Ligand SMILES: CCC[C@H](NC(=O)[C@H](CC(C)C)NP(=O)(O)CNC(=O)OCc1ccccc1)C(=O)O
Ligand SMILES: [Ca+2]
Ligand SMILES: [Ca+2]
């Protein structure tokens with residue numbers, strides 16, 4: 200909408216107060232003009248028609264319970280935009296400052312979030328398995344990263360390419376969580392998953408097996424559920440990424456960690472310069488090795504560590 204840029208204040212899903220960029224024209228809208236061609240957050244009003252209505256508020260204060268998922272969707276989209284711009288010199292998901300759109304309050308008791316090809320969508324959860332999913336910065340960045348992937352590598356959402364697609368979203372979701380530096384970890388969705396159970400998560404990158412996912416290629420799922428296991432086999436790549444950054448010895452194979460920033464540079468380069476829609480795990484290894492070679496040199500520790508990590512998870 201046409202209007203003047205303003206700054207509202209509210210509380211997110213976890214009860215934390217934050218400022219949000221809004222736009223004033225009769226109402227205050229969740230429209231952030233400070234980033235690219237805008238970040239726009241919508242109310243789906245418990246229905247499934249998208250995007251719904253651009254979020255409008257009478258007083259620029261967002262402290263109602265109903266407001267919380269919108270506050271976090273809007274704010275964490277901003278953080279994710281900043282990560283891609285400041286860290287990777289990428290302007291929005293398309294590299295050309297495309298407007299970023301999110302809808303919250305999607306459906307009823309909806310235990311998921313997704314990128315629908317054009318925008319991000321967040322359920323409120325059923326209050327048992329999830330609370331509103333935009334409350335997780337790793338979740339928001341996971342979803343926006345699907346858009347990045349679709350505009351770049353274009354990894355097809357099934358089988359091995361699909362598991363890479365998923366791992367890329369978990370990896371950058373986590374790197375954005377570290378970027379914001381609030382309770383960061385290598386777990387996925389812990390801030391919004393199972394409010395009745397402390398200390399768990401939807402997935403773990405550091406130990407995928409904790410939540411039932413493979414941490415070695417020999418344990419890959421080859422059935423048809425979950426698009427050929429895209430959220431399951433992602434554990435193999437998530438484990439490799441974790442090892443590249445933090446190091447460790449996994450099934451007897453030792454990996455020297457090189458840190459999160461270098462992990463991010465290597466995987467961002469792989470995603471944007473080497474991966475294709477049909478890339479498999481073996482091809483990801485090659486892409487990551489080449490990316491590390493480009494950035495740090497063939498004889499670098501960084502290249503050696505990438506190889507160690509993929510060796511450790513059984514990907515040659
Ligand atoms: C409990 C849900 C677990 C998993 N979802 C996830 O891991 C994350 C949300 C997490 C980070 C909180 N959602 P996601 O991976 O974006 C869901 N993906 C998805 O719906 O893809 C199908 C699709 C939807 C729309 C267009 C094209 C394809 C899943 O969908 O199995
Ligand atoms: Ca208000
Ligand atoms: Ca965390």
Ligand SMILES: [Ca+2]
Pocket residue numbers: 337373376383384385386387388389
């Ligand atoms: Ca996390």
Ligand SMILES: [Ca+2]
Pocket residue numbers: 389391392393394395396397398399400
């Ligand atoms: Ca929990």
Ligand SMILES: [Zn+2]
Pocket residue numbers: 341345365368
């Ligand atoms: Zn995903």
